[PDB]
Structures are given as C-alpha cells and as structure tokens.
Design a protein around this ligand. Structure first.
Ligand code: NA
Ligand code: NA
Lengths: 34, 34
C-alpha cells in the first residue's frame, strides 16, 4: 500500500519548508548582528 | 503586515505534522523492540 510513500512525501515537503524557515532565521540573525 | 503571522501559522502546522511523524516513529520503535 502506499501509506508509507505518502507519509515520506509529506515529510519531505515539511522538511523542505523547515529549511526555508531556517534560511529566513539566519538572514534575520545577520540583520540583527551586522 | 501579516507575512510574519502567515509564516508562524504555517510553521506551527508543520511542527504539528512533525509531532505526528515522531508519534509514529515511537510506535514503530515499540513494535520493533517489544
Ligand atoms: Na509504501
Ligand atoms: Na505580522
């Protein structure tokens, strides 16, 4: 069945979103610090 | 404006999804271990 494929696809999408939020966090750190 | 509100809403939704994936992970650890 493909429940585990669906789960892994959704997980990868969520991880990608979290990468973008961490991208933003570090941009904001640089504005704060420099 | 509301970009930062939208971002925090999306982030909370993604963190909630990761909590569910970690819930599943621990269930599967117990099936593997016990
Ligand atoms: Na599968
Ligand atoms: Na805002």
């Amino acid at each position: 069945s493909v429940s585990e494929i669906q789960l892994m696809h959704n997980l990868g999408k969520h991880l990608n979103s979290m990468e973008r939020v961490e991208w933003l966090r570090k941009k904001l750190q640089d504005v704060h610090n420099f």
